């Protein structure tokens, strides 16, 4: 079992906000950074988001990032038929000197 | 104890090979030479620059911080190292201000 | 442009040891801080470690118990993953990563780092 | 704010030119030149050293730290220069761990 | 054994600024940290403030209200003191330091330093 | 009058241990580091402790230094006729920010 808490699916109509919820503890999301990965069907994963709410180049504006205390949200944007694709979440573990993934959440879009 | 979880203040270090402009000794802004020659050999002039991931890692400021009675905060701290400089027509072997580490500052509260 | 080629996809027997390649095709591969996770068939993302080349310091997960050998050479500008007595569970696909970020580099800390570019993937089969 | 008291763990800044041996990038042992050429002009070979002033600047361990919740102490950390070196034969324009800050680390107790 | 050589004692009128050299024999200006602490006949030390030559980065204390302006010139080798608008009370013995170790050099941070190896004086006499 | 507080004449016999205290706040002594300035007359002074305990080359074994919280002590062991002078407290005064003295200390031996 993964030790980030994730939401096994979500579902959204296009072009609409959704957002993506993740759990934690003091040993991990309390004390450091939440990254988010895209992993599209047949494909490597992909990073999205890094040190909370900052983004890479090429990512664009739509995608957005935050943290509240052992809690991280993510926040897709004007959403699209590209955007189907499996969300994973990833933070360092000071307890467990690793780093933490997610169970991993399916957005579906009709 | 020596291994330690986390720092008060969290570090993130990058090798620089892309350095163009820098803020040299004194604080005048220099022009910073890609390359640098060794008689026989040619080098790319690489940095290695560690700074902040982010200033306030905890709510209150730095993390493990008395937060009831010090106003805390992370801060980047600078080394200074040779560099093949160019000013004008002319190359130059002098100090540029480059970050170093990631400390946290304390202020008492009122 | 610089980009992650990985080993070929195997299928070995149980007991074995597989090792997956990861070579940096460009430069400046002492620069990045190579980290490996793995994916099961339909399954959630595991990490099972890292190395940095430039320093050859590395780190792996407790829950392997000593298995996974991470290995890096600058010359060939290729970081391996060494899997040994595999197991039926162990069958996944395989993925390196590289980062230009180096977090927590401390004598007194354990220095690690983000998955920012992924390699395109070794699938390892464990026949049973 | 911004300009602080004092920071969590007090630095010591030493402009070193009388530098014979030092570490290497790999944790090698090599003799550092004490005179570098270019072409035509020598320097003498200089390099900005910060260390820690005393591991403990507080009883407890560093400034302004949560003592009944961490265990804590000053660590000295590093950046790698590149300086002219010998390994017995011949020169040798490589990095070499030099201490360039004093940082905390915690440590939860039990 | 590097030596700090001070200015001739002076003698001045109250309004009139007195400039204090400072010259280093041998050589490494640069990497000392360079004080001012002056001392009233039968009295104790009165900090002024400092300059570090190779950053041009200086500090004054707040009491003199700004009429300290410590200056430094490295092809010289040598730190001046300028104490503008004298009056009967600054009749003291002004002393130059030096220390080569350079505490809190930080952006967030007043940088300091000690007193390691002191000047001979110069005594400045103000008229009445 | 002066910031650290410092005992205004100090007697004893020749080759005796003798101490001279130093009282400071919070905002010096307690959470910075003490040295010791002698200065003997119609003589400049001269560093003979600094960072609490240390001493630099050529000052004697004979001279000790100590700090316990805002209170620093100084002790001349084995007592002689070119120990007679004044003796000053100096450290850094982190709310003033600037370097504090003590009122100074007169030696005497018979």
């Known amino acids: 079992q993964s030790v980030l808490t994730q939401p096994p699916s979500v579902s959204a109509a296009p072009g609409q906000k959704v957002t993506i919820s993740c759990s934690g503890s003091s040993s991990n999301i309390g004390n450091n950074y939440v990254s988010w990965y895209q992993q599209l069907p047949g494909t490597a994963p992909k990073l999205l988001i890094y040190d909370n709410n900052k983004r890479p180049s090429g990512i664009p504006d739509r995608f957005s990032g935050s943290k509240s205390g052992t809690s991280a949200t993510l926040g897709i944007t004007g959403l699209q038929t590209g955007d189907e694709a499996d969300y994973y979440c990833g933070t360092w573990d000071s307890s467990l000197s690793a780093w933490v993934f997610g169970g991993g959440t399916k957005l579906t879009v009709l | 104890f020596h291994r330690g979880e986390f720092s008060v203040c969290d570090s993130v270090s990058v090798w620089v090979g892309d350095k163009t402009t820098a803020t040299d000794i004194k604080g005048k802004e220099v022009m910073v030479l ?66 170093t580490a990631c400390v946290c500052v304390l202020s008492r509260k009122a | ?78 970081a391996y993953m060494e899997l040994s007595s595999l197991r039926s569970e162990d069958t996944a696909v395989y993925y390196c990563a590289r980062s230009s970020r180096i977090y927590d580099l401390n004598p007194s800390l354990t220095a690690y780092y983000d998955m920012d570019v992924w390699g395109q993937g070794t699938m390892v089969t464990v026949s049973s």
Chains 1, 6 share one sequence.
């Open chain 2, 34 to 99: 890609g390359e640098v020659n060794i008689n026989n050999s040619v080098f790319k002039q690489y940095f290695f620059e560690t700074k902040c991931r982010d200033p306030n890692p905890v709510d209150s400021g730095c993390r493990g911080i008395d937060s009831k009675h010090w106003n805390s905060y992370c801060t980047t701290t600078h080394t200074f190292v040779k560099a093949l400089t160019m000013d004008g027509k002319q190359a130059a072997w002098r100090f540029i201000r480059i970050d």
């Open chain 3, 1 to 78: 442009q610089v980009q992650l080629v990985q080993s070929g996809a195997e299928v070995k027997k149980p007991g074995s040891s597989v090792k997956v390649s990861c070579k940096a095709s460009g430069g400046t591969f002492s620069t990045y801080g190579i980290s490996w996770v793995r994916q099961a068939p339909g399954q959630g993302l595991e990490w099972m470690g890292g190395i940095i080349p430039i320093f050859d310091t590395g780190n792996s997960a407790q829950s392997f118990q000593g298995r996974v050998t991470i290995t890096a050479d600058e010359s060939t500008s290729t």
